[PDB]
Amino acid sequence: AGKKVLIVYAHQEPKSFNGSLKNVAVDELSRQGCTVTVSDLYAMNFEPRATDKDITGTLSNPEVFNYGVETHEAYKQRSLASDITDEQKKVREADLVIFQFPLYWFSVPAILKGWMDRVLCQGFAFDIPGFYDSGLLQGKLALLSVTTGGTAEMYTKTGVNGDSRYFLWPLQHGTLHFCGFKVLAPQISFAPEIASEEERKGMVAAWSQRLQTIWKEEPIPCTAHWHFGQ
Amino acid sequence: AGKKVLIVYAHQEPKSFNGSLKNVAVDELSRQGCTVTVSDLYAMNFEPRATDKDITGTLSNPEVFNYGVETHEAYKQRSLASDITDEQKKVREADLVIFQFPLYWFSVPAILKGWMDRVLCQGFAFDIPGFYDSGLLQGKLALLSVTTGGTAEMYTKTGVNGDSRYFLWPLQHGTLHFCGFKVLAPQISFAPEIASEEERKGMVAAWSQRLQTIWKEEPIPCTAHWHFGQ
Numbered sequence: 410a411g412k413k414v415l416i417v418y419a420h421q422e423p424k425s426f427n428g429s430l431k432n433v434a435v436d437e438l439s440r441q442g443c444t445v446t447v448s449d450l451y452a453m454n455f456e457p458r459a460t461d462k463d464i465t466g467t468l469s470n471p472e473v474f475n476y477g478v479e480t481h482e483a484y485k486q487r488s489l490a491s492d493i494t495d496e497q498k499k500v501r502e503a504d505l506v507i508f509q510f511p512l513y514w515f516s517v518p519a520i521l522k523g524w525m526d527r528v529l530c531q532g533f534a535f536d537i538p539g540f541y542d543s544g545l546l547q548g549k550l551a552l553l554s555v556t557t558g559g560t561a562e563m564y565t566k567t568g569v570n571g572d573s574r575y576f577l578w579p580l581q582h583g584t585l586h587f588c589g590f591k592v593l594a595p596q597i598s599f600a601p602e603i604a605s606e607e608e609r610k611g612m613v614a615a616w617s618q619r620l621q622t623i624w625k626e627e628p629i630p631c632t633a634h635w636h637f638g639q
Numbered sequence: 640a641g642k643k644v645l646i647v648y649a650h651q652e653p654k655s656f657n658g659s660l661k662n663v664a665v666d667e668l669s670r671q672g673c674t675v676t677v678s679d680l681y682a683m684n685f686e687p688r689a690t691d692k693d694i695t696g697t698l699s700n701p702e703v704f705n706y707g708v709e710t711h712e713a714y715k716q717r718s719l720a721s722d723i724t725d726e727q728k729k730v731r732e733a734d735l736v737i738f739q740f741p742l743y744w745f746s747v748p749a750i751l752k753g754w755m756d757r758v759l760c761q762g763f764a765f766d767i768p769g770f771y772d773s774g775l776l777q778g779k780l781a782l783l784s785v786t787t788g789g790t791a792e793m794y795t796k797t798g799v800n801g802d803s804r805y806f807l808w809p810l811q812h813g814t815l816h817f818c819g820f821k822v823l824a825p826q827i828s829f830a831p832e833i834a835s836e837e838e839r840k841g842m843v844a845a846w847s848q849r850l851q852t853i854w855k856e857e858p859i860p861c862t863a864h865w866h867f868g869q
């Protein structure tokens with residue numbers, strides 16, 4: 410029961426609520442004896458754009474650039490940019506990948522979207538065929554730890570934003586499940602800006618507490634029914 | 640007449656199918672006498688990361704960086720970076736905003752997500768609170784023109800990918816509707832890489848043909864029911 414964790418962290422400010430959730434994750438998983446690695450995207454100035462700079466080798470078709478085709482071939486040839494293969498090594502070795510981020514437009518901040526776009530390339534994360542339950546990262550776990558501006562009540566079916574699970578679909582299903590991850594239940598820390606100091610400390614403590622038993626959890630059924638109901 | 644269009648375009652390759660869709664849109668809207676502007680994000684090397692470089696001069700709190708607050712104040716104090724305010728001017732002047740992009744992980748490519756994150760800032764596109772039917776860009780139209788790897792069949796409710804409408808929710812509702820756009824029906828060009836020339840030119844012509852009467856269209860009811868309901 411020796412475990413490796415990658416935290417992909419997307420916040421600009423170390424003193425932020427996200428930074429605290431990231432740090433208690435590092436603290437608690439470290440205390441357990443886990444191997445822990447953090448990719449601090451903003452601190453890394455992580456490149457989010459999918460461009461032809463991501464391939465350094467002879468292009469398969471230099472007249473008409475197809476990012477998917479060229480990165481697939483570059484992965485197989487090992488001519489991807491090294492910032493991509495650095496992240497792939499971290500994912501390959503991880504048993505659990507935690508994404509820590511504030512919700513930006515019902516999704517991840519663009520710098521984290523770029524990580525998904527560039528790191529989870531064909532050949533590495535998935536193949537055609539070889540996706541969803543046949544994805545190449547099968548046997549791994551993923552978990553979204555998300556913070557919001559909106560309260561829990563705003564993110565219910567009858568709330569203004571609709572149920573929180575609705576916006577998880579592209580991330581949990583379209584991305585992580587597609588690559589073969591099993592998905593642990595999301596951690597959603599609602600509206601820390603609006604919360605009291607007590608409620609904030611409580612949300613941080615609840616995450617730390619959950620982490621104590623994270624390795625005993627079962628994943629969600631990452632299906633349309635789970636996300637949207639009947 | 641007298642209508643103004645902004646096309647926010649996110650593809651690396653001018654010869655691409657996305658490129659062709661953008662070009663027929665320019666051609667047809669120009670033919671109609673519309674005012675047309677294109678933001679070619681990759682050609683612009685558009686910055687996707689939400690950072691403290693987005694505010695010029697002195698920060699509202701140089702000790703603890705809060706992107707939302709700093710950009711809200713910067714917008715009010717006319718102290719945003721020029722790449723952002725250049726885009727805001729285009730959006731302000733536009734009656735219709737078309738987004739042309741390939742589907743990346745059930746969402747927009749990160750460079751376009753960064754446009755959404757950085758351009759549609761608090762004070763300009765929405766305020767806390769000032770939003771959904773009351774967002775700050777009310778009166779404007781928006782339209783997603785999306786290309787996919789997956790075939791139309793794969794994007795059915797019981798299909799592996801689920802209904803294409805499921806992944807539109809964060810884009811049409813959580814972003815565009817929230818900023819006050821009325822949302823025209825999406826243009827989805829399914830699986831051009833797999834399609835024949837016949838089908839590919841048909842899809843380009845469907846788009847060109849649709850643009851002929853775009854100004855007559857009713858917007859969708861951008862509701863949970865439209866996206867998820869039967």
Ligand SMILES: Cc1cc2nc3c(=O)[nH]c(=O)nc-3n(C[C@H](O)[C@H](O)[C@H](O)COP(=O)(O)OP(=O)(O)OC[C@H]3O[C@@H](n4cnc5c(N)ncnc54)[C@H](O)[C@@H]3O)c2cc1C
Binds near residue numbers: 424513556557601755
């Ligand atoms: C472009 C953009 C798009 C957005 N889109 C959405 C959206 O679609 N939906 C939505 O709901 N929201 C949205 N938001 C709002 C955003 O999700 C929230 O502002 C964000 O989740 C807040 O998290 P944070 O870490 O930045 O909070 P912070 O501002 O850092 O934290 C709140 C307070 O917690 C304090 N704190 C930090 N650590 C601790 C600790 N250990 N104990 C106690 N207090 C602590 C901090 O000092 C701070 O005062 C958007 C914001 C932006 C900029």
Ligand SMILES: Cc1cc2nc3c(=O)[nH]c(=O)nc-3n(C[C@H](O)[C@H](O)[C@H](O)COP(=O)(O)OP(=O)(O)OC[C@H]3O[C@@H](n4cnc5c(N)ncnc54)[C@H](O)[C@@H]3O)c2cc1C
Binds near residue numbers: 475789
């Ligand atoms: C990181 C990443 C994530 C992705 N995630 C998803 C996902 O979640 N879901 C999904 O379904 N797909 C996904 N895809 C696949 C992606 O959406 C498709 O590859 C893309 O939409 C194809 O569009 P294109 O413009 O790039 O096609 P192209 O390869 O440029 O075009 C297809 C063909 O059309 C030809 N063509 C160009 N102009 C014309 C014209 N005028 N008439 C006729 N033919 C023409 C081109 O020469 C080309 O041969 C992903 C891809 C990547 C790289």
Ligand SMILES: CN(C)c1ccc2cc3ccc(N(C)C)cc3[nH+]c2c1
Binds near residue numbers: 570602767
């Ligand atoms: C300080 N607080 C409470 C904030 C600050 C910024 C915010 C930005 C948002 C952007 C989109 C959105 N939706 C699409 C729901 C909700 C947002 N809520 C916010 C709440």
Ligand SMILES: CN(C)c1ccc2cc3ccc(N(C)C)cc3[nH+]c2c1
Binds near residue numbers: 537744
């Ligand atoms: C999340 N989902 C459904 C995805 C994710 C990535 C994808 C990448 C692709 C690359 C080429 C291709 N073709 C050439 C057909 C089809 C692809 N379909 C994808 C579907």
Ligand SMILES: [Zn+2]
Binds near residue numbers: 583630
């Ligand atoms: Zn799933």
Ligand SMILES: [Zn+2]
Binds near residue numbers: 711761762766767
């Ligand atoms: Zn304001």
Ligand SMILES: [Zn+2]
Binds near residue numbers: 813817860862
């Ligand atoms: Zn809506």
